């Protein structure tokens, strides 16, 4: 109980990753808690509902369907209960699931994917360690 989820998105993710898209949501509903959208991108609550339910119930599904966020399709490169990574051209996507939260961000074309992965996975590890 300090600060807000928008601080996390605006400070912990967007200040360390050059993002087209970032979101934190409820892992159970998909209810969006904070977000960032660049230019003409938008995160449907339905995109996140399905993402949230797929990562928790059947993460292998992303390998079949791909990943749908910001109104665009990303190719899945790996998927499990806690971590899903994706590609769309020169843009990377990293999605993490904690005990209560879903984190997601995607990168401006050409931005290093390891840096996004590190930022999202380490923030997820911090939250998970706090039982969030």
């Amino acid at each position: 109980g300090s600060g807000s989820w928008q601080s996390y998105v605006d400070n912990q993710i967007c200040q360390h990753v050059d993002c087209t898209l970032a979101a934190i949501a409820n892992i159970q509903d998909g209810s969006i808690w904070a977000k960032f959208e660049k230019d003409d991108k938008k995160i449907s609550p339905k995109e996140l509902k399905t993402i949230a339910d797929t990562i928790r119930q059947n993460p292998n599904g992303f390998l079949e369907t791909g990943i749908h966020i910001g109104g665009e399709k990303y190719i899945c490169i790996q998927a499990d209960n806690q971590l899903v990574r994706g590609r769309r051209g020169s843009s990377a996507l990293c999605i993490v699931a904690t005990n209560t939260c879903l984190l997601a961000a995607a990168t401006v074309d050409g931005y290093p994917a390891g840096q996004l992965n590190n930022v999202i996975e380490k923030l997820g590890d911090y939250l998970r360690s706090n039982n969030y």
């Binding site: 300090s2 912990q12 939250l127």
Partner: peptide, 12 residues
């Protein structure tokens, strides 16, 4: 609606 459940203090 209510605020969502509050985040923990930011990481280092």
């Amino acid at each position: 609606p209510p605020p969502p459940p509050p985040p923990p203090p930011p990481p280092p």
